[PDB]
Amino acid sequence: RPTILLVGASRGLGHAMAAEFLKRGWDVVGTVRADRGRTPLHALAEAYPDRLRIETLDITQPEQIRALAARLSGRVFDILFVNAGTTNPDPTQTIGEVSTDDFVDLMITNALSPMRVVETLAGLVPRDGLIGIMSSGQGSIADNESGQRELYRGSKAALNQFMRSFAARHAQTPLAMVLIAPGSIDESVPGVVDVLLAKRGRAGLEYLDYRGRTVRW
């Protein structure tokens, strides 16, 4: 059975993607923070005790990402998917209004830390494997005609740019990469997984939404 390493799978879209990959016959290794009591991912492992493994990880600590990579060494995953990021509690703040702490925290959680996950765990994917990262339609600079969610938008545009440079470093390889714009969950998640499955084996980085359409950068 094919295997996916899904970073950030405790709740929300991450838990839904784990269940959807399980539904399609994949084995899943999903990560959560250890300092949570009990998450939907723990319930899902009780329903799939043979096919879902849970690992704990705070991705804002690079040593923990490295420790996870060392623990999984020798293991090969067909997909690495990074589902990392959050929002500011008041997304209506303008960039001129946010505190320095607001700005630093969200840039670290949404752009630096997912890229560190990709770079550190990339070795657990075959040279022709797939690495996917949860981005957002808000990260598209061409599409930003309306503003709003200003800090979040900037964090996701930096993420997309960082990933394009990572892709450039792999331009001579058959590595497949995708930034996903997820676009309730039952309407979005089956598509996201369709898109990931359809992207396997197609080398290079694309920016794709949950219906598989190219998102302008």
Q: Which residues bind a second copy (CB under 8 A)?
A: 94-98, 100, 103-104, 107-108, 111-112, 115-116, 118-120, 139, 141-142, 144-148, 150, 153-155, 157-162, 164-169, 216-217
Query: Is 66 annotated for ligand binding?
Result: no
Query: Is 85 annotated for ligand binding?
Result: yes
Residue closer to a second copy by CB (options 10, 136) is: 136
| Shortest separation between residue 108's beta carbon and a second copy, angstroms | 7
3-state secondary structure the chain: CCEEEEECCCCHHHHHHHHHHHHCCCEEEEEECCCCCCCHHHHHHHHCCCCEEEEECCCCCHHHHHHHHHHHCCCCCCEEEECCCCCCCCCCCCCCCCCHHHHHHHHHHHHHHHHHHHHHHHHHCCCCCEEEEECCHHHCCCCCCCCCCHHHHHHHHHHHHHHHHHHHHCCCCCCEEEEEECCCHHHHHHHHHHHHHHHCCCCEEEEEECCCCECCC
| Shortest separation between residue 154's beta carbon and a second copy, angstroms | 4
Query: Is 65 annotated for ligand binding?
Result: no
Residue closer to a second copy by CB (options 95, 198) is: 95
- For the annotated binding site, the residues are 10-11, 13, 33, 58-59, 83, 85, 152, 156
